[PDB]
Amino acid sequence: MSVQAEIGILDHVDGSSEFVSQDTKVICSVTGPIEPKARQELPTQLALEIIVRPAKGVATTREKVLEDKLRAVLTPLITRHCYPRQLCQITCQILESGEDEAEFSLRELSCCINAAFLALVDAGIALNSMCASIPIAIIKDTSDIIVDPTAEQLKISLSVHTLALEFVNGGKVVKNVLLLDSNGDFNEDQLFSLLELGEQKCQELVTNIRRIIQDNISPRLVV
Amino acid sequence: MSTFIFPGDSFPVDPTTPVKLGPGIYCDPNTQEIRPVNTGVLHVSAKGKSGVQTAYIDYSSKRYIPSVNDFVIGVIIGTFSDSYKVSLQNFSSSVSLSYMAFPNASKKNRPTLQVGDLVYARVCTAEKELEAEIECFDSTTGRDAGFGILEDGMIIDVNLNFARQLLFNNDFPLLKVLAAHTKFEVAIGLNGKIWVKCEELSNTLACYRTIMECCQKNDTAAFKDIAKRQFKEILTV
Amino acid sequence: PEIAYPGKLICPQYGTENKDGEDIIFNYVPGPGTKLIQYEHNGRTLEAITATLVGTVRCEEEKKTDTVKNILVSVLPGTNDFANNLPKEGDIVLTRVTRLSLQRANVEILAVEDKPATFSVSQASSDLGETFRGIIRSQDVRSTDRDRVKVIECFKPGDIVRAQVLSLGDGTNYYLTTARNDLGVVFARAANGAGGLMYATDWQMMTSPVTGATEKRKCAKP
């Protein structure tokens, strides 16, 4: 869980970030609230334009799924009723997969969730709470649950998991499970053991994120 | 050092105390609970302020959101019957400036402004689900208006925090450091726009370069010394 | 007229009979679901009422206070649909406010009213702009003081407004009005749907039981 992030790296965007876990590096940018296109307009709430760009080649249907899952996480996080008939552009440029993209998209999704959240924080957009996402995997010979697995570990995995939780009260109370994307062969006992260990490492991540956010933003503010 | 807060954290103040909610603080229409939605430093006004305490969160932002009683710098971009279409900030929703509200206003009388002009304007009304309205003369102004066209000069992009500090904080040395070198006028907008003019372009340019450098570093100490190197470089020719 | 299908002949344009030593003239008028079509047969032309819909044939006739008897021949559905009952001038409709700007209030038609009630619902999607959009001008909001009308205090985004059609307008927007007692905001929630249910206590005021907050609107007379 030795992640590293930077905040406010882009000039022509309201907010930006660069999240790095292992070899997975994703840069994200957020502009909003701004004027929306007519087809995007929502009478009462904020409209989200979510874009995911791959590390190699052009955006395909694969990234279209990454956009969809990332939408399921960011939508309830943002206090959308504060910005009626308005738009918020959220762009993720995956710079380095950190995994075999022909087989997995686990680490890229988690890194996009964490980066998007950080970019939303930087942009100063109304959020109902905080959030953290981690990738998890299981190995058949080992029987182990490995949090933040490497690319080599994924190759020999039986199941891959993306867990993103919603935290409140100083990152101590799990408000809800924003996203759990479990793929592969697994049983009910493995699922809850995954959720128990997953919640712990997620809570540790929020604490680390809270540290990063305060370290970067506080110099900008005044005492 | 300050007491930082994050969205979804517990709100310190007790419901038994009447609290006026400012920026960053949100009152849920469904559960009636008061909760912070922005990330930054929580500021709570001292008690005794007419029995009402004002609590808000100072958070970093650069995308302006129109609020009533704000002095802003807009650019005319449009013509509509009964008003000007003015843009506070790029890609943001346009604001309206009625033909009615001007310094020596008349319904018959009309403004001479031409699309592309900078206006020092006050935002009297900012409905959340409706286009922003900007007025050059305000009833609050009560017969005194600083509102109107800005001629020539140079405009500068600046984050909302830096602009707010430049407008409301008198301890901000930026104006002073620029006064000990040359004399010029400045318009300050809460929408993150700063208008600077001098008699000579080289001085306005020097001011432009200083404000950006000081906005970038955000180190209060640097500017007087930072300004000194900037003034010198212009004469380098 | 047991059965009606599109293209089936119903009756000639005129009819007659003999009652009480006097000949009564029946003037058949093409109503909704029918149309006068000129056919040819035996060399001589002929105009006959033809059903254009599938359903049970119905007729109506009437004299009002404000020998030939005028009969109205029509065809009703036999077995919901917003097709045959498309919004025309004078019709009352239920629409939802999509956007507000100072100049006008904009709503999309969701359903249509009928005379003694019942309703017709548009099956179109509001997500794809498939619904017929309309416009309520500021001077068509209410009847009294139409010069000084604040839109923000009459409607809100998401409000369900019962309005009446003034004209078809262009292909983009219908033109509606709410300048009657039984017209205006009918269904609404506090804070644009972020709050609880609000009922029309006053004709100009909306009140909510749990919220404890009152928001003004141009509501229909309760």
Place this chain on the structure above:
Amino acid sequence: FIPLLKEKPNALKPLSESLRLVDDDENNPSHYPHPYEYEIDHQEYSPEILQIREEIPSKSWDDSVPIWVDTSTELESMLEDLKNTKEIAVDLEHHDYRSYYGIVCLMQISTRERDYLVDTLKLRENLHILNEVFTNPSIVKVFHGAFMNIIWLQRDLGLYVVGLFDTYHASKAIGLPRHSLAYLLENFANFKTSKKYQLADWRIRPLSKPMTAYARADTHFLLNIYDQLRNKLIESNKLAGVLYESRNVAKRRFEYSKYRPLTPSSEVYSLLETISVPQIRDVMERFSVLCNSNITNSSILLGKILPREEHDIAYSKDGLPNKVKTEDIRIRAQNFKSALANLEDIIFEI
């Protein structure tokens, strides 16, 4: 209206001067004066209302049962008990559907220790003895939203209040976001208010345990609100204002509608010939000619599955699929339609 009480405890001005026929002025007509108007103006407030003090929480709801008071004896015991307090909380329930002016159906009274529920129907002619305590100025009487209740005590029971503290004025003076009484219960007692019981007439007995429970909770909530008002108001320099408002609420005397003052104040409550028939006849003929002249399904491939009637299934405890009756769907629909239409009509907002 002729006041119903011949006994006036805690009196500063004999009941005599109280029973005085006033003349008819231009502003208002003749009518009896509020009997305790004097004492409400003169009698000193208990000096303990005046100090900021640590708050006393409500008793835990479950350490006690509400005390039902419907005999003269229970009432007298209750009276002896209230005589021992320094403050009490009071509320009423009023019914106006099956009565012209209305009748007082219940009285709720709480001490720091216990909650009382008084059958004001059975004890209508008995309740005046509470004037001992209700007009004792050294015992605070805490009401929320009592401006009407003051009138009704008068009208029905002949009861008056000297030493009133109204938490509604307290809430306003403090500038709280919601005046509502439940708000206090919701935030301080962690108790969720229920609307439905009030709307239906409260006359029916025995009273429902749920229907008892809200009243039991409500008095405690009111007491808590009063406590909140007492210390913050003192702190805020606003207590004097609330006692003034409270005396104005207490001061007013109910009057008959005919006798009500002229200026309504908050002090008092009260052509076709052309086509031939023959020519048309020919039309009927040619039509009959035209009309007269005009005069199994099996599925090869997708005919079987595409137009399949909608069926529903419900898995039981054993995990076996059960076909919902085609009939069942219709029955729910009829019932659902019934439920909304009957259901829709009634709603009361306070």
